[PDB]
Design a protein around this ligand. Structure first.
Ligand SMILES: Nc1cccc(CN2C(=O)N(Cc3cccc(N)c3)[C@H](Cc3ccccc3)[C@H](O)[C@@H](O)[C@H]2Cc2ccccc2)c1
Lengths: 99, 99
């Protein structure tokens, strides 16, 4: 669908039997989910953000269902304020920005 | 234009008489630009992301051109590594995000 940006673009995701809401984020290279039980199998990783690095864990090959859209990639879970879908997954959903 | 998200969506702004590139970022509600020479007065403000919070200076009523499209709005300037165009300008140049 077409999201305007008057309001944060949120979407519902399903992920490991859990239902969440997450920001569709084009500046984020990586999807970051706040803490969750994902079964695995993860390595650690640190990403940077605005003013600081966080230690996050990398799960790979995780089915996410974002709107009616199944996709699979890496998600990182970690102590984020807000769950964020970045461009590793936005490219699978076929997201576009238009201006 | 339409940009797909296979790489970072970066566009040139002209601001303050200066040319820069900035990220177009749907997930940011404010624009945050690395440290630069902008005139005016400004107020202290603190903003948070991943990692935590930065204090930026806030300037208001600033002319940005982002591709060939002018915008006036609040620009926060401060320590960030990436200059971000966030929803407040993005709304004005009419970006939409579609999938
Ligand atoms: N790799 C990666 C994955 C996930 C998140 C980030 C880090 N980000 C942020 O810190 N943000 C704070 C940010 C950035 C700009 C403006 C504001 N208002 C906030 C928000 C995400 C966010 C966090 C918390 C609350 C709301 C949103 C922004 O929407 C994201 O695009 C990037 C912007 C960015 C900063 C530094 C380096 C690269 C990219 C990076």
């Amino acid at each position: 669908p077409q999201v305007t940006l008057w309001q944060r673009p949120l979407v519902t995701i399903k992920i490991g039997g859990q239902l969440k809401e997450a920001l569709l984020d084009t500046g984020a290279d990586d999807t970051v989910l706040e803490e969750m039980s994902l079964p695995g199998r993860w390595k650690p990783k640190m990403i940077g953000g605005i003013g600081g690095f966080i230690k996050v864990r990398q799960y790979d090959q995780i089915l996410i269902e974002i709107c009616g859209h199944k996709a699979i990639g890496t998600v990182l879970v970690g102590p984020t304020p807000v769950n964020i879908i970045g461009r590793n997954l936005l490219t699978q959903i076929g997201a576009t920005l238009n201006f």
